[PDB]
Ligand binder design. Structure first.
Ligand SMILES: N#CCC1(n2cc(C(N)=O)c(NC(=O)C3CC3)n2)CCN(Cc2ccc(-c3ccccc3)cc2)CC1
Ligand SMILES: N#CCC1(n2cc(C(N)=O)c(NC(=O)C3CC3)n2)CCN(Cc2ccc(-c3ccccc3)cc2)CC1
Lengths: 281, 286
């Protein structure tokens, strides 16, 4: 018996966790005894892209880090990705609900854990390209995990970036200017996304101070097909998301190093881990 | 009786000639005698659910056109007030987009260069009055006769301040991006030199008889290509940064393509002027 082979006939749908417009992530129970005692799993599948999900499956199968969601296996009819279920969900769901329990010290420990997870990915020559609070899962009050790798791409040995072709669904309010301007994705681009994610974590993912809400207030909400060129212009003039309420200036200064215009001038994940650990002493 | 005062009760709507986001231009007959012998007129008006600044902007447009007098600018006729309406002459041939595909056999290169000259004279008259047009495209160039064109819409026209070189725009979501200079796409800044860049695109349209399969939009989307209703403009900017331009129209001589390329220098200060373009076409027509 292969423990990473899930039979379709025992994978019972409970409900949806998430949707792109090419597929979904569902809560199922793997229940081979038919009595509802089976483990709950998160199951990624396509609407009725296949090559892309097969590559994503193969990336996650071979990642093993305490701050990366666990691969559990596949269901093959078409193919489904079986992952551990984290019932606390993303930081976007968990933080608004748990402000009273989650103080600054705990936010800096989640930041360190996100940086460790990201630096392990970068070490395997991957660029994530979708690092946001909605993709960071809460394992417990004390631990988070990167929970989705839908846009993760390999960087070829002795290249520095991956160039993207399908960009129409880009999370632009999280993207470094080289991604907006030239569709180029470097590890330094994930560091820029991490700065935005840290901004979300420090605002407890409140929807009224999201990266999108705050950038739209800055550039104007009614520019349609010009939205992205105004955002790049704004970033060109030096403007950045403001210091979160209650956020100490030396945390804000580590965030700002994620957002130097030029990839080569941004902080490393290792430098961020050291900065946060210094603040935690 | 003011001949520029059109009474609503005599303005009979016939059909739509054009539609934007906030208003339309309609073919009407102004028929005071009630017997269908009145003149046909083109009528610009706002949609009911109009919006914030649209009335102010149409009233500015009306004052702009009222005081333009040039043989290659559509003629103001008057207004209708009740929800103000701009009354213009009606040109039954329509725009180059309607006319050129139907009339390839009679419109040869010499006639195309004369139309280019007449567009540049109209544009240089508008520039002379400190206006930037910001919408110069074949769909806004009307055909008076086989021998004459007129610039027939001023919906985006603005005054450049005395001792400024550009106008900065804020309402941009409906921009004709495949006609826009990089400084318009990147900074929403509009110079007379920006209208020169649009003129070069409009020349390309004229030289392709406005065929839809070689439109500026079709040719740029095949270059960049059809990516997202959110990243399209930043790919287009990148394409232009790298030096890519619309190719030479089939049958277009290189000496005409070279006048068109002087329109499309990346830096506004490096682009040809309208008076230079007129000179170059006139040299070719000799
Ligand atoms: N991490 C995280 C958040 C997502 N996620 C994963 C888990 C987990 N493993 O437990 C989870 N948990 C919860 O929501 C619990 C109820 C509170 N949410 C995973 C991504 N998904 C969005 C998504 C992204 C990509 C696709 C997709 C699939 C195939 C092809 C193309 C795109 C589909 C959905 C949102 C939920
Ligand atoms: N020139 C030219 C082509 C337009 N146009 C003007 C005329 C004319 N005077 O004869 C014309 N003629 C024809 O089409 C004949 C039948 C073949 N077309 C005018 C502009 N319009 C587009 C447009 C532009 C702006 C607005 C607008 C109105 C109010 C508020 C905001 C925007 C509405 C429509 C397209 C047709």
């Amino acid at each position: 018996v292969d423990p990473t082979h899930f039979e379709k006939r025992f994978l019972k749908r409970i409900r949806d966790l998430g949707e792109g417009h090419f597929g979904k992530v569902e809560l199922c129970r793997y229940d081979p005894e038919g009595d509802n005692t089976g483990e709950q799993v998160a199951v990624k599948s396509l609407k009725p892209h296949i090559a892309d999900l097969k590559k994503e499956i193969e990336i996650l199968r071979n990642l093993y880090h305490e701050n990366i969601v666990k691969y559990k296996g596949i269901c093959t009819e078409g193919i489904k990705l079986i992952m551990e279920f984290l019932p606390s969900g993303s930081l976007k769901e968990y933080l608004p609900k748990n402000k009273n329990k989650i103080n600054l010290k705990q936010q800096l420990k989640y930041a360190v854990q996100i940086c460790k997870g990201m630096d392990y990915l970068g070490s395997r020559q991957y660029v994530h390209r979708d690092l946001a609070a909605r993709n960071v899962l809460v394992e417990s009050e004390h631990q988070v995990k990167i929970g989705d790798f839908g846009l993760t791409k390999a960087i070829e040995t002795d290249k520095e970036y991956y160039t993207v072709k399908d960009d129409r669904d880009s999370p632009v309010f999280w993207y470094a200017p080289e991604c907006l301007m030239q569709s180029k994705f470097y590890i330094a681009s994930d560091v820029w996304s991490f700065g935005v994610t840290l901004h979300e974590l420090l605002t407890y993912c409140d929807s009224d101070s999201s990266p999108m809400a705050l950038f739209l207030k800055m550039i104007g909400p009614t520019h349609g097909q010009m939205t992205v060129t105004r955002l790049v212009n704004t970033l060109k003039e030096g403007k950045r998301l403001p210091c979160p309420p209650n956020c100490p200036d030396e945390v804000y200064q580590l965030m700002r190093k994620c957002w130097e215009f030029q990839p080569s001038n941004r902080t490393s994940f290792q430098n961020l881990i050291e900065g946060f650990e210094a603040l935690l002493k």
